[PDB]
Amino acid sequence: EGSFIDNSSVELTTRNFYFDRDYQYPAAKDWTQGFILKANSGYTEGTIGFGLDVLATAGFKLDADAEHGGTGNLPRDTRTNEPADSYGEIGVTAKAKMSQTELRIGTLMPMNPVLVASPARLLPQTYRGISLTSKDIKDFDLQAAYLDKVNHRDSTNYEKIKISGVNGRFKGAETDGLYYLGGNYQFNPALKLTAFYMDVDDLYNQTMVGALHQYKINDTTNFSSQLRYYRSRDDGQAKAGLVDNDLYHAHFELKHQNHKFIFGTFQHHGDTAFPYLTGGETGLLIDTWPGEFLNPKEKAYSFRYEYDFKEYVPGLCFMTRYTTGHNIYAPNLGGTNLKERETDFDLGYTVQSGWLKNLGLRARYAIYDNNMLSTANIKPVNETRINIDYTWKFK
Numbered sequence: 001e002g003s004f005i006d007n008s009s010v011e012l013t014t015r016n017f018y019f020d021r022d023y024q025y026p027a028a029k030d031w032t033q034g035f036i037l038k039a040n041s042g043y044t045e046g047t048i049g050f051g052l053d054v055l056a057t058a059g060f061k062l063d064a065d066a067e068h069g070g071t072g073n074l075p076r077d078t079r080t081n082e083p084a085d086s087y088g089e090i091g092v093t094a095k096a097k098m099s100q101t102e103l104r105i106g107t108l109m110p111m112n113p114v115l116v117a118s119p120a121r122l123l124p125q126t127y128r129g130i131s132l133t134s135k136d137i138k139d140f141d142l143q144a145a146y147l148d149k150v151n152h153r154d155s156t157n158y159e160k161i162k163i164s165g166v167n168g169r170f171k172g173a174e175t176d177g178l179y180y181l182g183g184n185y186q187f188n189p190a191l192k193l194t195a196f197y198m199d200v201d202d203l204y205n206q207t208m209v210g211a212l213h214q215y216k217i218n219d220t221t222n223f224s225s226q227l228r229y230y231r232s233r234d235d236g237q238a239k240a241g242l243v244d245n246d247l248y249h250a251h252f253e254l255k256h257q258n259h260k261f262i263f264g265t266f267q268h269h270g271d272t273a274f275p276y277l278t279g280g281e282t283g284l285l286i287d288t289w290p291g292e293f294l295n296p297k298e299k300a301y302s303f304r305y306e307y308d309f310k311e312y313v314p315g316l317c318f319m320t321r322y323t324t325g326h327n328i329y330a331p332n333l334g335g336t337n338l339k340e341r342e343t344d345f346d347l348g349y350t351v352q353s354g355w356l357k358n359l360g361l362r363a364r365y366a367i368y369d370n371n372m373l374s375t376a377n378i379k380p381v382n383e384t385r386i387n388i389d390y391t392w393k394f395k
Contacts, residue, residue: 007042051095058088072121101134118280142183152279207231244270262304300325319346334373360389
């Protein structure tokens with residue numbers, strides 16, 4: 001009984017994480033230590049191959065006053081509100097696969113343009129469900145899933161999925177489950193086109209379409225164009241209320257030598273905001289941090305620089321971004337035509353290479369403001385994140 005175990009991988013990340021959200025509601029602030037264990041067995045020999053994945057996860061308090069609770073890093077007692085001394089999920093996934101087409105059941109971590117299990121706090125959020133995925137049809141990279149429960153990043157248990165009522169944009173309310181499906185086509189070597197559909201029962205459905213385009217000029221000098229469209233609405237009884245949003249997101253990139261230069265825009269049309277699920281973020285951006293820019297009717301613009309430092313220090317890498325929003329419609333929260341500001345700074349040192357393969361060191365700072373009412377959930381804030389990740393590889 002060889003492959004299953006000869007090919008198994010076994011990795012253990014250790015993170016030390018400091019999170020502080022300060023306003024001028026008190027600070028939401030903690031210092032925490034994490035442990036993430038992934039064991040994915042190889043595949044059994046045969047026409048069909050069988051396997052077993054394991055996620056084992058544990059967080060511990062280091063300094064965390066109860067009055068600064070509810071960052072996403074520790075759960076908190078629903079009687080007393082103390083953030084826990086410690087906590088841990090154990091999840092398990094089965095696998096089957098012929099060719100390059102696989103089928104999974106149990107803990108899952110979807111990551112596509114409509115849906116993202118959340119990496120953004122100490123521990124990941126997971127769903128449970130069934131996926132199917134396949135690259136066997138030529139040029140098509142596909143995925144589908146049916147998901148029925150969710151385990152949060154700051155919880156221990158599988159709950160029912162539900163929709164965020166942030167800012168009063170929608171009545172929060174829970175579903176029985178959701179599916180997605182889509183993937184993408186490679187049209188020709190420069191161009192690549194994407195399509196998804198996600199139906200969340202009695203809550204909302206969504207259409208995503210898109211296209212990425214590559215164009216090179218030098219060895220050092222490079223440029224891409226991505227144009228996406230998202231049509232968000234109601235499946236059946238619509239227990240959330242009205243959902244009527246059309247989003248257009250264009251995103252361009254010029255890389256020259258070690259520098260990048262990036263422009264984004266969101267353009268919202270319709271009567272409401274762009275909906276999403278609780279305990280996480282969106283499949284729109286890989287991160288955009290405390291400010292999110294999804295208010296109803298909003299028009300927003302984003303500018304980004306990056307600098308890779310190979311020349312001086314292999315592994316070192318820097319970023320900064322200015323993001324502005326407007327014609328924002330929230331009469332409950334102080335007006336039509338409101339606005340949002342953010343300034344992000346981000347410094348990542350990661351050692352690929354060497355005997356410290358996989359050692360991470362990272363600062364992130366954000367300065368977010370608005371002119372909306374103090375009684376909004378998304379509130380003017382200055383957030384700090386520092387983390388120290390290392391990973392062992394036992395096999």
